[PDB]
């Protein structure tokens, strides 16, 4: 199976509220395993999974120091980016950064990422090649020239191909029964009349671990191309989703729901 490790950092300015809010979460696949919150009591990188708690004191001092260094940097970035766009000091603004790496079935490096946003819009991103930056506007081109000078891409490329992949392999081994599991979706269908001549068929998929799932309708033979909600967390590690069709009554028997998920041998 394909696997990934991602880090998500959000920094938000709080004019008049004092220091800006910093939140960081670390995922392996769809499983959160670490977090930091500037508002939380500890001021430490906290564990959010069982298999990570077996890592030693040196690991936790290291991650905390690194995340504190990320926050201190963002605390600057917020101010720098206001200057570039000439914005007011009294307004709240949002900086977001996501990085991580991708490993194939064979656990070898597949891809790397490092993206950066300002007020929910693309700012600057590392390309596919991991040697180069895409700058979204004139402001980010300033940052491009600064980061080309400071050799950022070259030192990120070392992390993404090396440290990122080797610790992802280590996490996959530590938390094997949690991360290398595949919970197949528990499925059923519900019926409600909505009219004299119409009725809703809802197709449920629940308690499935990997969020990658496809719910599709068919009538007789061809895919029924209709309501579909975003995949949602159950809150216990597994995920949920439903899909519905409004169908003429007395003709519910000619509709079928199709479920594709890596936990299922073949589609249901």
């Amino acid at each position: 199976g394909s696997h990934s490790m991602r880090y998500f950092f959000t920094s938000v300015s709080r004019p008049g509220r004092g220091e800006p809010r910093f939140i960081a979460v670390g995922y392996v696949d769809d499983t959160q395993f670490v977090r930091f919150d500037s508002d939380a009591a500890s001021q430490r990188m906290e564990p959010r999974a069982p298999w990570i708690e077996q890592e030693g004191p040196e690991y936790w001092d290291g991650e905390t120091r690194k995340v504190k260094a990320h926050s201190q940097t963002h605390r600057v970035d917020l101010g720098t980016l206001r200057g570039y766009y000439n914005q007011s000091e009294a307004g709240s603004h949002t900086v977001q950064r996501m990085y991580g790496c991708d490993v194939g079935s064979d656990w070898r490096f597949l891809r790397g990422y490092h993206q950066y946003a300002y007020d929910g819009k693309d700012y600057i991103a590392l390309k596919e090649d991991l040697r180069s930056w895409t700058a979204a506007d004139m402001a980010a081109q300033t940052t491009k020239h600064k980061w080309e000078a400071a050799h950022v891409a070259e030192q990120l490329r070392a992390y993404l191909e090396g440290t990122c992949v080797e610790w992802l392999r280590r996490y996959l081994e530590n938390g094997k029964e949690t991360l290398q599991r595949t919970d197949a979706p528990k499925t059923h269908m519900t019926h409600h009349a909505v009219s004299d001549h119409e009725a809703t068929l809802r197709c449920w998929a629940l308690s499935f671990y990997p969020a990658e799932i496809t719910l599709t309708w068919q009538r007789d033979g061809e895919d029924q191309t209709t309501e579909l909600v975003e995949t949602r967390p159950a809150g216990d590690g597994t995920f949920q989703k439903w899909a519905a069709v409004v169908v003429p009554s007395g003709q519910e028997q000619r509709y079928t729901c199709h479920v594709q998920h890596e936990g299922l041998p073949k589609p249901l």
């Binding site: 880090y7 960081a24 670390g26 690991y59 290291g62 991650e63 690194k66 995340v67 260094a69 990320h70 940097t73 600057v76 970035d77 720098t80 980016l81 990085y99 950066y116 600057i124 300033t142 940052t143 600064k146 980061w147 400071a150 950022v152 030192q155 990120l156 992390y159 440290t163 990122c164 610790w167």
Partner: peptide
């Protein structure tokens, strides 16, 4: 294991 490589901007 986070990254050590974080440059201001």
């Amino acid at each position: 294991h986070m990254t050590e490589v974080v440059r201001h901007c």
